[PDB]
Design a protein around this ligand. Structure first.
Ligand SMILES: CCCCCCCCCCCCCCCCCC(=O)OC[C@H](COP(=O)([O-])OCC(O)COP(=O)([O-])OC[C@@H](COC(=O)CCCCCCCCCCCCCCCCC)OC(=O)CCCCCCCCCCCCCCCCC)OC(=O)CCCCCCCCCCCCCCCCC
Ligand SMILES: CCCCCCCCCCCCCCCCCC(=O)OC[C@H](COP(=O)(O)OCCN)OC(=O)CCCCCCCCCCCCCCCCC
Ligand SMILES: CCCCCCCCCCCCCCCCCC(=O)OC[C@H](COP(=O)(O)OCCN)OC(=O)CCCCCCCCCCCCCCCCC
Ligand SMILES: CCCCCCCCCCCCCCCCCC(=O)OC[C@H](COP(=O)(O)OCCN)OC(=O)CCCCCCCCCCCCCCCCC
Ligand SMILES: CCCCCCCCCCCC(=O)OC[C@H](COP(=O)(O)OCC[N+](C)(C)C)OC(=O)CCCCCCCCCCC
Ligand SMILES: CCCCCCCCCCCC(=O)OC[C@H](COP(=O)(O)OCC[N+](C)(C)C)OC(=O)CCCCCCCCCCC
Lengths: 86, 91, 44, 125, 655, 486, 198
């Protein structure tokens, strides 16, 4: 190619090394795209149930109930809101 | 599942020489503290639900839940048995 | 562009790490299914 | 030049050569050294504080001497901030009041309880 | 079997990891295409997600497994794509896809392309983890790992010494901010007992201002580091030692903006911490001024443009201190589009020249030679100069206006500081345009015989980014800068809302002077540089020294090393030698050894003469008997007197 | 069957293997992997729903000395585990085979003596965690000194002799004042056992004294400022197993000693003298980090980092909070994964190839030794505490609890997040950076043995960095037993 | 691997047979450091003894039962094969491979396999699987953390105090339990603090 220079061949890295372009890469590229696609599908199908919209899950009546019970606990324990002590 | 439900012992009713009772009381005090923590966590979850559903209204609809959380946080937490096992408050 | 000597895809590290990772995954899924069918997991 | 730290270590050298340090960053780059990157020859003697005076050390600057540099940096900063204070006395008045809101400053919607209005109550109306 | 969010998060992870495992098997060719194509698929997911959210605006979540549920501390690996997140994703995903396509033609001839492309996707995946995470902890993960990835990218040429040192500077400013960030995390969790945005923002209106002040000061100090404001902008100009695409993606559009994202997300807290808002504003005005001054008087190209980035970041921080979050958010989106384009055009310039120089003083008149690179750079410069209809006008003038439209009285000065930053913007932009395209040549001849426009891989990204910097502002100003938009529903304190006053109080003088001056000084300095060039070439010794101040970054680069770093290394060696190897060996092995050397040599040199061992030991009996009779006599009458007698005896025996 | 017949079978097989093939390291590696499995089985059979001590066995009783005691009068050494002890046990069985395997080919004189000494140190450390009385702890705390001295003096580097006297004299000094405190406990309480020692409430004025002798020791073992000067030398001149064993386990013994001797007893002295501890730990952090910035020897730098992370861990465990305990422990675990990897890289890779540890020679490994570069950077970013690694999760939690107890000291100690990065990256940049050193010729990339080791030590820390919650099933009692709060 | 593959005469001949050779660290260098310095029949002689190193010359039932004077011969005459094999493996950068049919082994370059280390069979098949067992066990003991037990006990104490919730629909009891938890206290910490009450 353009601008090249020698390099040791015994040097082995998980990455290419120097100007790595083996004469089989179409097959290995096929294997890698297949694994990557299968992984992406497995992940999306697995994470589907663990999704939810921020809203729409919890009814407001439940929120009103919970806030009522909050007031009940607060007054049983005789507590006052922020700033009232003035 | 076979959910165990052990027995509740206290340090004020035992003599400290019968080690089994002391271990029972230690485990009891710690288990109840963990239960207080779980109650706090449920409050936290409901608060986040009130915020995520309300939005700009959270200032009102989540008020008591938020004050309840901020009152529970300093008290509902692990604080250990040794400070009651080695201190009688009646003196 | 120039070519380099051929290199296999399924080098041993791929086989080891992929098989172990995916085997632990398969075990997790199987035990979750066993728990769905019974009251406990298999390793339990 | 031997700096403070490098001549406070005079009593301790014993037999070691008391070299006069010179950072490599200022050495002539066009000369052929054995180690061309660090600008060091093979059997070149090393100063006791060579870790400060090699190329991996922090960079020196040869334009401004550092005292004048500190004068210039702090003088720029002080000019800026003093102008930004002085120019607060030469400010025009606002052409309109802040907005104001209907329900008593929205103390209810800001999380009030009829007694904390000072803390949560927005502008009057 | 569809999940926008799952696919957004896994596909970049695939493109980062698969090359690292499989690169020797796949070759740099297929790796460049696979990472490019996967990050293309991701960008389409985000544009379509952006459409859907505009239709509905109920964000999706993704609640994964637990990292730590110990005691009053639940941290899950939660994820979410909200309004602010989807805007940061639009900048990240679009810019990263363009760069993955531009860095094919730029990085051909480079042997190590695989590791380069793996790192680009690594940074992309980790910023995606930053903007998405529904808790401060998932943010800190992305904060650290992008600084890690920045170290590797800036160090991509591991032989080049200066690249390594710039990498160390960048990652050590990162940790100088991250330390305070952890201090803020420790405080957030002491106070609220949690780390997630939902609880903290549903409560922050109840907790003591001193606590939020401590929190936000620390988080801001972290944002000051990453966003490269005046105190810690050292690393940014040094970060240009890496390849250009890295400058296009990280230090232009994305990595620096992580601090603005943190502040925008913590805006629901910042509204109750006026002190930090005031500091953020004034630090930002310092940045936006110092950067422009440092840019007008610089000769490197990438340096100038990175300093322009420092200025726009300072103007975003200004807006945040004026409590107009949506405006700085919008300027982020624009600032990505009209700055990554500049860095790409800078690369096509630099490669058209033979020796890959970065000095405008040796560029000259490539206009006829490089027209396409020219039209693209001038588009971005005008989108930087707030020309009408371009994104920069909408994104920038409105901040210059809210400076006047704020309810605070003392913010009026910041209008002028921003305005001087603006006329400086048109200065240094037109300087690059004249020095690079319009001027007389200043290289040799062969440079002009071999200048040539660069391949398709370089142009097409500049084409698309040019379309975005032309149209995105008018297409999205109804979402962000609109009147009652509700898209980014940050709970503004009503007292601080001034957008109505900003748009109405503002007069003609204070709505025209920026635009007028941006045209006029721009054309003027062109006229001076082309007809009266003496004005910039006086050779006065008092002007040239001021040029020397504004070169070398307001000598701060020399303040930092000498007074902080060098007086840290010396103090460190003062410790290591004088303490760790000095007094603490003296109160230990060395001193005890010398102490015992003497004491043993004085103990045994006691029965001195071997000439007659008998009379000596006999005299020793007599001394001991007499000494004990007299010692007991003294200690009968008083015992606090015999003690020194025994100290001195021990001296006599052991000295 | 006969117990004696089974071990006679083992000893016979060992004698025949020794006689045919004149080496033991295969049998020791087999025994090490066997111990790992048997400990795993104990974990399978360990109930997490009990704060009590399980698998109790007593030794050296009056009635049955060479066996086990089932008597109603216990006068011997006790043993047994809670979940705390099991954690470090899993760390120790996990490391011992690797500490042997990091020295599989470079020891060539009197090899069998070396592998004996390594296994004896590793087994003695293992049994120290099972200890359930002050005296059994002490006699297994001090039993590593003769072996460490011998190991270092024979198989050590140039300055082995000075290092061997230093590990002995310093540790013996601190241990002896520990013996005084234990002896005062033993003549007062007339019992030493880690079962019911928290019931006995000594007077405060006596806790103030016993504490000083326990803490003098723990200052000398952990170490802590100003008794931090033995560790760099003993690591610098030790053989590779000596460094891995030390940093991974022996420094963790000081933390186990605090939690098991010093907190459940002496509670009131802890809550009174904690601020002095915060002074000492803070000085340890910053000064050792700054001392690291100006060192020249590779192995010494890793050593100084070990002092710093232990000093953070002391901030957390001595903080009177749950998160402090769970962080300080996780620091000890992740540290015992990361530091051995670095000592392997700088002591059994580079020193094996080129036989020198000075940074000035080393530069440009990335060109010819790339895989070693990748491992250096990963371990360097795990050492400093990059998240998704246990050395961050433990840093954060300990600094949560240190901030709670004293906010100022717990926040001024957050600069460790920076200083660790400084003294580690100033080095990593040199090694992976630049053009290949002219002084060094080329040698092979990392071999599969060393790649095995580093990949284990990284997978383990990545796991606990990704889901630390797995370790809670053993520790959910321990985070609350040692909290003195009314 | 084999059981009773020992042979006395072969070892007792091989002793002097190796003694007739020069020392291992000097055979392949010839005191100058050149592989070609050795002769050819010498080279094949060395390579053929060295291939013998990785050959089954003893078995388990032979090491457990035979005497010391024979095992000592095996030890001291096998150490020599070890040394020769490995010195030649380093210096020549070849291994000795006898092909299938011809009974003549010589040094060869092929090294892409057929070479294993003595530490592999132990570790990869006894250590690593045990570590994986440890991981599986930590994961499936994490199910026994107190957080889940405590959640389960809180729900049960609520259902005990307030049985009525059980007849309500099966995807509402969660919110009802939440309401009842937020209402009051189902902990008994103040019931264990008895003397604290004055
Ligand atoms: C106290 C309590 C303590 C608690 C401790 C907790 C217990 C500890 C657990 C320890 C596990 C140890 C397992 C083991 O022994 O492995 C040995 C063995 C050692 O590695 P080796 O390959 O033999 O080394 C020799 C070289 O390969 C031979 O040399 P070479 O020429 O072939 O060089 C190759 C080498 C050279 O390359 C390098 O140097 C690169 C640096 C290596 C870094 C590796 C760190 C891990 C990176 C993970 C990346 C993921 C990011 C996300 O690169 C590699 O080997 C790495 C390959 C990268 C992976 C392959 C991609 C396939 C996908 O590894 C294995 O056989 C596989 C183990 C993999 C397990 C990972 C776990 C994943 C879990 C799945 C997730 C989903 C389910 C999880 C829940 C499960 C519930 C049941
Ligand atoms: C005196 C005792 C101090 C004890 C407390 C610790 C204080 C902070 C840490 C300082 C200690 C000294 C650090 C020395 C490390 C030096 C390591 C090294 O050798 O690398 C040098 C590197 C700069 O590399 P350089 O040579 O300049 O390369 C550029 C050319 N391309 O160096 C660097 O990149 C610098 C890394 C450190 C960055 C720190 C920046 C601090 C700036 C603060 C400004 C004020 C901001 C306000 C903060 C608010 C606080 C309330
Ligand atoms: C009722 C009250 C009784 C209580 C006891 C009171 C103690 C009184 C002690 C006085 C008795 C005489 C012993 C004095 C030590 C004898 C040697 C001496 O005089 O010390 C000098 C020694 C000299 O060092 P240098 O200057 O290098 O050598 C040239 C000396 N012409 O100095 C040195 O080598 C350097 C010293 C550095 C500091 C080392 C500190 C070590 C502290 C721990 C000591 C533990 C060992 C104790 C040894 C006991 C010996 C008696
Ligand atoms: C507590 C007691 C401390 C014990 C410390 C051990 C001191 C051993 C140092 C001396 C020594 O050489 O150990 C003897 C060892 C065999 O030594 P070796 O290397 O194999 O020499 C040839 C054998 N005939 O024999 C051993 O294997 C002893 C190992 C212990
Ligand atoms: C503090 C402990 C300490 O400081 O112990 C370190 C020194 C070690 O002395 P050394 O240098 O190794 O002796 C030199 C021996 N050579 C030359 C054979 C190697 O202990 C001592 O001198 C005595 C301890 C006094 C306890 C008080
Ligand atoms: C998060 C858990 C870990 C994730 C898995 C990461 C390891 C994958 C293996 C990488 C192999 C490699 O990168 O190659 C190693 C590269 C080789 O460079 P080269 O491109 O091949 O060209 C070869 C040209 N030399 C020979 C001239 C270099 O050495 C280096 O230059 C040092 C850079 C290390 C990059 C580290 C990758 C990012 C990981 C950081 C996460 C903490």
């Amino acid at each position: 190619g353009g601008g090249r220079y020698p390099f040791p061949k015994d040097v082995i890295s998980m990455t290419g090394g120097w100007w790595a372009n083996p004469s089989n890469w179409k097959l290995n590229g096929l294997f890698a795209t297949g694994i990557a696609v299968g992984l992406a599908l497995w992940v999306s199908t697995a994470t589907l149930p663990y999704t939810r919209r921020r809203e729409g899950i919890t009814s407001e009546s439940d929120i009103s109930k919970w806030n009522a019970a909050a007031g009940v606990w607060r007054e049983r324990h005789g507590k006052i809101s922020t700033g009232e002590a003035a | 599942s076979e959910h165990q439900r052990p027995e509740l012992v206290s340090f004020d009713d035992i003599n400290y020489n019968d080690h089994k009772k002391v271990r029972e009381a230690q485990e009891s005090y710690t288990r109840e503290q963990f239960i207080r923590l779980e109650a706090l966590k449920t409050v936290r979850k409901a608060l986040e639900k009130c915020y995520e559903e309300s939005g700009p209204n959270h200032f009102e609809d989540c008020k008591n839940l938020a004050e309840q959380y901020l009152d529970m946080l300093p008290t509902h937490r692990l604080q250990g048995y040794l400070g009651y096992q080695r201190n009688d408050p009646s003196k | 562009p120039e070519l380099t000597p051929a290199v296999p895809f399924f080098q041993p590290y791929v086989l080891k790490w992929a098989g172990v990772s995916l085997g632990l995954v398969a075990f997790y899924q199987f035990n979750s299914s066993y728990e769905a069918k019974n009251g406990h997991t298999w390793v339990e | 030049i031997r700096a403070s730290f490098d001549k406070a270590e005079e009593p301790m050298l014993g037999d070691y050569p008391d070299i006069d340090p010179f950072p490599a960053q200022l050495k002539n780059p066009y000369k052929k050294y054995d180690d061309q990157q660090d600008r060091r020859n093979l059997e070149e003697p090393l100063s006791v504080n060579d870790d400060l005076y090699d190329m991996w050390s922090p960079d020196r600057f040869t334009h401004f001497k550092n005292q004048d540099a500190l004068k210039y940096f702090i003088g720029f900063l002080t000019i800026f901030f003093g102008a930004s204070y002085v120019a607060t006395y030469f400010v025009p008045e606002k052409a309109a009041i802040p907005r104001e809101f209907p329900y008593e400053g929205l103390w209810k919607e800001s999380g009030g309880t009829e007694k904390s209005k000072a803390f949560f109550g927005q502008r009057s109306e | 079997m569809y999940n926008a969010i799952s696919l957004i998060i896994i596909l970049p992870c695939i493109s980062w990891l698969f090359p690292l495992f499989f690169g020797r098997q796949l070759g740099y060719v297929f790796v460049t295409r696979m990472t490019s194509t996967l990050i293309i698929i991701t960008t389409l997911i985000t544009y379509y997600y952006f459409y859907q959210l505009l239709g509905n605006n109920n964000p999706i979540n993704l609640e994964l497994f637990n990292y730590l549920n110990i005691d009053y501390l639940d941290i899950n690996y939660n994820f979410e794509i909200d309004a602010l997140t989807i805007t940061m994703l639009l900048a990240i995903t679009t810019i990263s896809s363009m760069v993955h396509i531009y860095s094919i033609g730029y990085m051909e001839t480079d042997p190590h392309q695989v590791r380069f492309f793996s790192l680009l996707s690594m940074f992309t995946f980790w910023m995606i983890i930053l903007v998405t995470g529904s808790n401060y902890f998932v943010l800190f993960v992305g904060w650290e790992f992008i600084g890690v990835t920045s170290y590797l990218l800036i160090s991509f040429w591991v032989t080049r010494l200066q690249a390594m040192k710039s990498a160390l500077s960048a990652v050590l400013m990162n940790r100088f901010g991250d330390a305070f960030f952890v201090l803020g995390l420790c405080v957030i969790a002491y106070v609220f007992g949690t780390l997630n945005y939902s609880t903290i923002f549903a409560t922050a209106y109840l907790i003591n201002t001193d606590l939020l002040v401590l929190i936000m000061l620390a988080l801001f100090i972290a944002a000051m580091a990453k966003s490269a404001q005046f105190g810690l902008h050292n690393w940014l100009t040094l970060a240009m030692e890496g390849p250009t695409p890295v400058s296009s993606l990280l230090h232009a559009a994305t990595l620096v903006t992580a601090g603005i994202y943190l502040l925008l997300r913590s805006a629901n807290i910042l509204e109750y911490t006026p002190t930090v808002l005031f500091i953020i504003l004034w630090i930002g005005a310092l940045t936006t001024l110092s950067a422009g001054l440092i840019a007008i008087c610089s000769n490197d190209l990438k340096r100038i443009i990175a300093l322009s980035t420092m200025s726009q970041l300072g103007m975003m921080t200004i807006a945040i201190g004026l409590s107009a979050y949506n405006l700085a958010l919008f300027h982020l989106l624009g600032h990505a589009f009209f700055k990554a384009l500049l860095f790409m055009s800078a690369g096509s310039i630099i490669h058209s020249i033979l020796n890959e120089s970065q000095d405008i003083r040796t560029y000259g008149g490539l206009l006829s030679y490089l027209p396409y690179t020219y039209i693209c750079i001038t588009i971005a410069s005008l989108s930087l100069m707030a020309m009408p209809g371009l994104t920069g006008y909408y994104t920038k003038d409105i901040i210059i206006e809210s400076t006047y439209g704020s309810y605070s009285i003392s913010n009026y000065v910041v209008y002028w500081i921003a305005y001087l930053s603006a006329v400086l913007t048109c200065v240094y932009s037109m300087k690059i345009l004249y020095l690079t395209f319009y001027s007389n040549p200043n290289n040799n001849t062969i440079t002009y015989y071999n200048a040539h426009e660069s391949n398709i891989y370089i142009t097409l990204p500049m084409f698309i980014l040019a379309i975005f910097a032309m149209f995105a502002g008018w297409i999205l100003k109804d979402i962000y800068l609109g009147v009652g938009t509700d898209f980014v529903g940050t709970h503004i304190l009503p007292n601080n809302f001034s957008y109505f006053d900003t748009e109405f109080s503002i007069t003609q003088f204070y709505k025209l002077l920026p635009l007028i001056s941006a045209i006029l000084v721009s054309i003027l300095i062109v006229v001076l540089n082309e007809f009266f060039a003496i004005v910039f070439n006086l050779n006065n010794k008092y002007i040239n020294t001021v040029y020397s101040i504004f070169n070398q970054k307001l000598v701060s680069d020399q303040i930092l090393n000498h007074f902080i770093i060098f007086k840290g290394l010396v103090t460190s060696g003062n410790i290591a030698h004088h303490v760790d190897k000095g007094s603490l060996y003296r109160l230990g092995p060395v001193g005890i050894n010398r102490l015992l050397n003497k004491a043993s040599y004085n103990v045994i040199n006691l029965s001195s003469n071997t000439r007659s061992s008998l009379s000596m030991n006999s005299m020793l009996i007599l001394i001991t008997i007499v000494s004990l009779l007299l010692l007991v006599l003294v200690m009968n009458v008083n015992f606090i007197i015999v003690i020194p007698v025994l100290i001195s005896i021990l001296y006599i025996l052991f000295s | 069957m006969f117990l004696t017949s089974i071990l006679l079978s083992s000893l016979y097989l060992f004698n025949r293997i020794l006689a045919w093939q004149g080496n033991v390291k295969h049998f020791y590696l087999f025994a090490s992997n066997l111990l790992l499995l048997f400990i795993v089985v104990l974990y399978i059979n360990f109930n997490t729903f009990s704060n009590s001590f399980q698998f109790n066995f007593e030794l050296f009783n009056s009635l049955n000395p060479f066996g086990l005691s089932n008597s109603d009068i216990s006068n011997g050494l006790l043993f047994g585990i809670d979940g705390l002890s099991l954690t470090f046990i899993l760390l120790t069985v996990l490391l011992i085979p690797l500490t042997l395997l990091g020295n599989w080919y470079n020891i060539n004189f009197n090899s069998n003596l070396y592998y004996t000494l390594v296994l004896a140190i590793g087994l003695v450390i293992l049994l120290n965690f099972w200890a359930l009385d002050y005296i059994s702890f002490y006699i297994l705390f001090e039993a590593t000194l003769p072996l460490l001295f011998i190991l270092i003096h024979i198989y050590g580097s140039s300055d082995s002799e000075r290092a061997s006297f230093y590990v002995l004299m310093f540790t013996l000094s601190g241990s002896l004042f520990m013996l005084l405190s234990i002896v005062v406990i033993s003549i007062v309480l007339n019992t030493t056992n880690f079962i019911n020692h928290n019931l006995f409430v000594l007077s405060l004025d006596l806790q103030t004294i016993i504490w000083l002798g326990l803490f003098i020791a723990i200052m000398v073992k952990t170490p802590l400022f100003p008794i931090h000067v033995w560790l760099p030398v003993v690591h610098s001149e030790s053989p590779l197993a000596g460094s891995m064993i030390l940093a991974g386990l022996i420094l963790k013994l000081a933390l186990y000693a605090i939690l098991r001797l010093l907190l459940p007893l002496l509670c009131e002295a802890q809550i009174l003298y904690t601020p002095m501890i915060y002074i000492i730990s803070l000085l340890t952090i910053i000064l050792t980090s700054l001392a690291t910035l100006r060192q020249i020897d590779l192995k010494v730098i890793i050593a100084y980092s070990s002092i710093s992370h232990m000093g953070i861990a002391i901030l957390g465990v001595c903080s009177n909070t749950s998160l402090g305990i769970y962080g300080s422990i996780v620091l000890g675990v992740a540290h015992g994964f990361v530091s051995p990897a670095l000592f392997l890289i700088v002591g059994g890779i580079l020193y094996d190839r080129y036989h020198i540890r000075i940074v000035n020679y080393y530069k440009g490994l990335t060109t010819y030794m790339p895989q070693l570069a990748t491992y250096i950077i990963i371990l360097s970013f795990a050492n400093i505490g990059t998240p998704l690694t246990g050395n961050f999760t433990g840093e954060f939690l300990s600094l949560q609890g240190g901030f709670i107890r004293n906010p100022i000291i717990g926040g001024i100690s957050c600069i460790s997040v920076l200083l660790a990065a400084i003294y580690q990256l100033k080095l990593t940049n040199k090694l992976t950076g630049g053009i290949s050193s002219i002084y060094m010729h080329r040698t092979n990339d990392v071999t599969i043995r060393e790649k095995f080791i580093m990949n284990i030590l990284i997978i383990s820390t990545l796991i606990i960095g990704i889901c630390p919650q797995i370790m809670y099933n053993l520790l959910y009692w321990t985070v609350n037993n040692y909290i003195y709060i009314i | 691997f084999a059981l009773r593959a020992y042979n006395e005469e072969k070892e007792l001949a091989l002793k002097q047979r190796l003694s007739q050779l020069p020392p291992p660290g000097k055979a392949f260098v010839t005191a100058e450091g050149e592989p070609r310095p050795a002769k050819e029949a010498e080279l094949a002689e060395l390579a053929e003894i060295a291939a013998l190193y990785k050959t089954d010359r003893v078995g388990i039932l032979d090491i457990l039962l035979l005497g010391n004077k024979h095992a000592r011969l095996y030890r001291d005459n096998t150490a020599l094969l070890k040394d020769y094999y490995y010195n030649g493996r380093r210096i020549l950068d070849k291994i000795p491979v006898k092909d299938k049919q011809t009974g003549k082994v010589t040094w060869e370059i092929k090294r892409e396999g057929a070479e294993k280390e003595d530490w592999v069979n132990q570790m990869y098949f006894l250590y690593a699987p045990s570590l994986i067992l440890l991981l599986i066990v930590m994961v499936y003991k994490s199910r026994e953390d107190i957080t889940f037990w405590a959640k389960k006990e809180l729900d049960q104490r609520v259902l005990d105090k307030h049985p009525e919730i059980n007849d309500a629909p099966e995807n509402e009891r969660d919110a009802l339990i939440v309401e009842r938890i937020i209402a009051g206290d189902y902990d008994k910490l103040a019931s264990l603090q008895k003397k604290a009450t004055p």
